[PDB]
Amino acid sequence: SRNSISELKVPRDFVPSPGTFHGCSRFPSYSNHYGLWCYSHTVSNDTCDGSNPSVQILSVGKLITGDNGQPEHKTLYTQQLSQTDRLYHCSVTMTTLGCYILCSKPRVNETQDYETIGIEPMIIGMLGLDGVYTDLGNPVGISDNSLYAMYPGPGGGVMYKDFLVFPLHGGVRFSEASKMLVLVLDFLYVCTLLDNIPGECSIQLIPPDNMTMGSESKLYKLNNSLLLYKRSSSWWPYTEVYQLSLRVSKNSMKVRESVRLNITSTTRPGVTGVFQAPGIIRKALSEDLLFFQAWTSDSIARQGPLISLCRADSCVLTIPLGNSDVFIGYTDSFCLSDRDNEKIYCVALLELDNMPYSEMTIRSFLYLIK
Amino acid sequence: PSRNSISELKVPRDFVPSPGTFHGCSRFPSYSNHYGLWCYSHTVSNDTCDGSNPSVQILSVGKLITGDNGQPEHKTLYTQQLSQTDRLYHCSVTMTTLGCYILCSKPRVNETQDYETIGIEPMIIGMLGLDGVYTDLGNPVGISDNSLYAMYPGPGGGVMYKDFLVFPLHGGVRFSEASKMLGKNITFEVLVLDFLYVCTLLDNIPGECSIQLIPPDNMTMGSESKLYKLNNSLLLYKRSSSWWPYTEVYQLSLRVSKNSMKVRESVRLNITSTTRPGGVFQAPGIIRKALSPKESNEDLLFFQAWTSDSIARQGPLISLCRADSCVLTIPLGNSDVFIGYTDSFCLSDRDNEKIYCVALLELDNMPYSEMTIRSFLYLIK
Ligand SMILES: *[C@@H]1O[C@H](CO)[C@@H](O)[C@H](O)[C@H]1NC(C)=O
Ligand SMILES: *[C@@H]1O[C@H](CO)[C@@H](O)[C@H](O)[C@H]1NC(C)=O
Ligand SMILES: *[C@@H]1O[C@H](CO)[C@@H](O)[C@H](O)[C@H]1NC(C)=O
Ligand SMILES: *[C@@H]1O[C@H](CO)[C@@H](O)[C@H](O)[C@H]1NC(C)=O
Ligand SMILES: *[C@@H]1O[C@H](CO)[C@@H](O)[C@H](O)[C@H]1NC(C)=O
Ligand SMILES: *[C@@H]1O[C@H](CO)[C@@H](O)[C@H](O)[C@H]1NC(C)=O
Ligand SMILES: *[C@@H]1O[C@H](CO)[C@@H](O)[C@H](O)[C@H]1NC(C)=O
Numbered sequence: 001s002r003n004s005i006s007e008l009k010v011p012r013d014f015v016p017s018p019g020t021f022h023g024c025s026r027f028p029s030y031s032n033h034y035g036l037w038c039y040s041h042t043v044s045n046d047t048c049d050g051s052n053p054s055v056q057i058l059s060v061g062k063l064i065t066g067d068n069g070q071p072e073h074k075t076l077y078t079q080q081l082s083q084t085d086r087l088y089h090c091s092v093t094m095t096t097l098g099c100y101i102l103c104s105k106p107r108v109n110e111t112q113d114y115e116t117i118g119i120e121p122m123i124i125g126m127l128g129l130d131g132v133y134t135d136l137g138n139p140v141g142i143s144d145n146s147l148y149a150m151y152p153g154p155g156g157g158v159m160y161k162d163f164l165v166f167p168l169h170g171g172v173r174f175s176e177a178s179k180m181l182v183l184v185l186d187f188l189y190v191c192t193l194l195d196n197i198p199g200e201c202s203i204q205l206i207p208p209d210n211m212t213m214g215s216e217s218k219l220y221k222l223n224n225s226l227l228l229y230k231r232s233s234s235w236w237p238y239t240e241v242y243q244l245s246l247r248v249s250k251n252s253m254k255v256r257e258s259v260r261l262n263i264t265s266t267t268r269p270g271v272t273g274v275f276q277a278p279g280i281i282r283k284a285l286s287e288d289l290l291f292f293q294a295w296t297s298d299s300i301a302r303q304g305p306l307i308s309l310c311r312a313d314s315c316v317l318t319i320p321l322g323n324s325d326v327f328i329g330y331t332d333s334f335c336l337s338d339r340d341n342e343k344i345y346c347v348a349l350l351e352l353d354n355m356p357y358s359e360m361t362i363r364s365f366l367y368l369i370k
Numbered sequence: 371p372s373r374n375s376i377s378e379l380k381v382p383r384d385f386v387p388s389p390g391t392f393h394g395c396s397r398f399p400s401y402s403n404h405y406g407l408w409c410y411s412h413t414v415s416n417d418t419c420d421g422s423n424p425s426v427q428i429l430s431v432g433k434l435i436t437g438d439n440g441q442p443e444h445k446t447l448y449t450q451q452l453s454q455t456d457r458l459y460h461c462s463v464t465m466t467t468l469g470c471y472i473l474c475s476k477p478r479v480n481e482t483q484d485y486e487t488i489g490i491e492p493m494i495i496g497m498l499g500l501d502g503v504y505t506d507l508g509n510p511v512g513i514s515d516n517s518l519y520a521m522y523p524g525p526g527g528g529v530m531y532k533d534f535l536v537f538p539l540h541g542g543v544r545f546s547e548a549s550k551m552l553g554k555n556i557t558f559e560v561l562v563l564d565f566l567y568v569c570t571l572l573d574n575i576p577g578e579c580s581i582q583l584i585p586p587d588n589m590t591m592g593s594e595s596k597l598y599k600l601n602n603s604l605l606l607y608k609r610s611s612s613w614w615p616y617t618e619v620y621q622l623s624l625r626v627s628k629n630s631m632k633v634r635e636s637v638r639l640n641i642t643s644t645t646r647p648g649g650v651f652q653a654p655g656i657i658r659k660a661l662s663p664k665e666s667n668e669d670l671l672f673f674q675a676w677t678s679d680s681i682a683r684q685g686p687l688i689s690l691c692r693a694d695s696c697v698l699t700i701p702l703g704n705s706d707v708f709i710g711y712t713d714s715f716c717l718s719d720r721d722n723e724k725i726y727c728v729a730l731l732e733l734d735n736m737p738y739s740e741m742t743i744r745s746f747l748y749l750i751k
């Protein structure tokens with residue numbers, strides 16, 4: 001590594017625009033598998049808060065080495081899912097067969113859902129590398145009486161040891177949660193990816209011992225270990241990343257424990273939270289943690305959005321994005337490594353204020369760290 | 371023909387590229403298509419696109435395909451970024467069978483300072499071919515130093531008229547020199563008038579290029595402009611430079627010769643359906659011209675994304691209009707919804723009773739940057 005970070009022109013953004021004058025897009029969801037990637041977000045009209053029906057956009061493509069050796073996201077196929085009464089809540093996971101998407105289609109707002117036993121309807125689908133979208137129907141493995149609510153993402157899932165894994169968070173009664181082990185907790189949706197159809201799908205509860213209340217989340221796969229980023233939904237002020245240790249068997253993956261990384265380099269502005277998921281370049285494995293993050297700083301020295309390259313306890317590089325009036329909403333980042341060391345590219349997916357045209361829009365941006 | 375139905379369509383893939391960086395702005399859409407070939411271009415700077423920062427120019431060529439549901443789709447084949455210039459680019463593009471030709475001014479000073487100094491600011495002409503090669507054709511030949519104080523093309527696009535490559539211009543010429551060019555004394559100091567850049571396209575290289583003055587008798591002061599070719603006649607849309615409130619479109623009658631194209635007269639079409647706010651460049655897409663401008667304009671049909679500041683309609687509008695009235699109007703929002711420069715063009719489907727119109731809109735991008743451009747698609751059935 002070196003002490004250098006700069007922005008690069010992205011001539012062709014792989015993130016599609018809302019597609020109409022008053023359209024808004026929210027909730028970027030990204031997943032890449034080696035050189036293949038999948039991107040998804042939710043599109044509604046005027047406002048993206050659930051008061052209007054929405055659709056989901058799903059893109060798969062591949063990485064090419066464009067001008068100057070920087071990576072480029074080449075879109076191969078795009079699919080729009082059917083309209084839903086309110087918001088989509090989706091998580092995507094890229095595989096060699098294509099992109100799998102897990103979504104919740106709420107008919108009511110979040111508060112009304114958590115007060116009623118039973119989860120809102122869900123779908124799981126797949127966009128193949130041949131551009132064909134297959135609706136795999138209702139995700140199998142969901143018990144009615146046990147669960148009050150269940151939402152995937154918005155972060156992406158990962159492929160772990162031939163297992164299809166999605167991040168979830170939902171409401172489970174204390175009695176039913178203790179059995180598995182109304183509370184709000186963090187879950188994994190674990191499927192076996194035998195052929196083209198997922199099988200042996202179940203909801204695994206993550207041990208909430210060292211964790212905050214369940215929240216919007218993202219999965220990582222690093223050095224054959226699972227990490228979980230969580231939107232801070234509690235008084236805990238620091239970016240939350242948990243190390244997950246599993247116990248794998250044939251057609252069985254359960255979460256044994258969840259260890260919170262001691263991150264104090266970046267914080268949330270609250271003295272709720274915002275989903276601002278980092279791009280993890282180097283895992284901890286047990287001071288070596290290095291990550292890239294687009295976050296909102298409320299410090300006295302820096303008020304406003306920042307692009308940072310940070311260790312667990314400190315940030316080594318920071319790019320101010322503007323004054324406190326520059327709004328960024330949800331953010332998700334990921335970094336692509338160059339086999340030749342000492343060159344790192346990170347992409348920042350940013351929700352941007354789009355008023356008075358519509359609530360929000362998403363764009364991506366490219367940063368070089370040398 | 372037409373009926374009372376217009377609706378918007380999702381543009382899954384916008385052929386208009388985004389500024390490409392967080393604080394980037396893009397301004398001054400310029401578009402041109404030739405049969406199934408199209409060319410698009412705009413100006414890109416950092417933070418602000420007013421000349422206070424260096425800028426580059428983005429240039430795209432592509433082809434039209436029949437996308438999902440039978441609607442037209444803009445497939446980009448190649449994109450080119452020109453070298454950085456100290457201030458703004460002022461560019462006009464013209465799509466041909468060989469590719470896209472771009473004519474630009476690279477001013478080193480602001481517009482007021484330029485019109486006070488004899489001589490035009492530096493200019494370039496280049497071509498982006500259908501083979502993806504960008505060729506820098508150098509300084510446009512045919513521009514006289516001592517006569518002209520300023521010369522700016524576009525931002526509207528040019529046309530291919532017979533074998534001539536034609537670009538819209540506007541610039542500053544001294545009264546004596548303008549009367550010479552016109553042949554007659556001008557009838558009501560540096561005057562601001564409207565010009566054409568006319569070249570013969572001998573093979574791959576334009577030749578015998580000159581600046582032609584448009585007879586300003588029936589016209590307002592020169593301004594940002596756009597060329598059209600309809601029923602083998604040239605039309606000129608002009609940004610309003612006067613108290614005259616209506617969208618200005620002029621009919622041009624030419625006199626063609628070997629290596630010579632001169633403008634014989636410029637007739638203002640009597641358009642009263644739309645007006646300019648305040649001017650702002652909001653150029654319409656003209657679907658059907660008048661078979662005889664001096665006889666009537668009842669056949670004129672056009673599509674326009676414009677700002678209405680009337681008391682009855684305040685805010686941006688999408689309109690399908692005759693010369694004297696608009697038959698369909700889509701409100702884009704309240705008066706707080708800003709659109710800047712505008713350019714539209716329509717693609718008709720003869721078989722079906724369906725017309726597609728694309729609106730290129732400057733949109734406010736604060737506080738990220740000054741401006742951004744997006745395209746939007748409308749179906750008229
Ligand atoms: C979308 O929202 C805009 C205002 O943001 C409104 O004018 C328009 O009618 C809406 N369209 C639909 C289909 O609801
Ligand atoms: C959710 O919907 C219920 C239904 O009436 C309403 O009472 C409640 O205020 C809503 N909550 C939010 C946060 O909008
Ligand atoms: C984290 O949680 C696991 C089980 O939930 C527990 O074994 C461990 O002691 C906790 N603290 C750590 C790993 O630092
Ligand atoms: C977490 O890191 C901070 C950084 O200085 C340190 O002060 C604190 O003791 C650490 N916590 C633990 C449990 O080691
Ligand atoms: C672009 O503008 C931003 C603020 O608007 C400024 O911080 C940055 O240095 C500028 N970049 C260049 C290359 O001028
Ligand atoms: C334009 O440039 C001149 C020359 O420096 C300067 O005096 C003037 O203030 C600038 N702005 C104008 C003329 O609006
Ligand atoms: C044309 O105008 C100039 C200056 O106003 C004048 O000196 C000249 O005599 C005029 N010529 C004719 C033919 O009107």
Ligand SMILES: *[C@@H]1O[C@H](CO)[C@@H](O)[C@H](O)[C@H]1NC(C)=O
Binds near residue numbers: 634
């Ligand atoms: C002005 O318009 C009239 C008819 O409207 C036309 O006869 C005349 O030639 C025009 N003048 C010029 C200089 O084009």
Ligand SMILES: *[C@@H]1O[C@H](CO)[C@@H](O)[C@H](O)[C@H]1NC(C)=O
Binds near residue numbers: 601658
């Ligand atoms: C050409 O003129 C004819 C008759 O005046 C008219 O029907 C037709 O629409 C015109 N074509 C265009 C492209 O305006």
Ligand SMILES: *[C@@H]1O[C@H](CO)[C@@H](O)[C@H](O)[C@H]1NC(C)=O
Binds near residue numbers: 640641642693694
């Ligand atoms: C233009 O046409 C309108 C009728 O649509 C008429 O009222 C107006 O006087 C005309 N203007 C001119 C200059 O002939």
Ligand SMILES: [Ca+2]
Binds near residue numbers: 116
């Ligand atoms: Ca419920």
Ligand SMILES: [Ca+2]
Binds near residue numbers: 483490518519
């Ligand atoms: Ca000058």
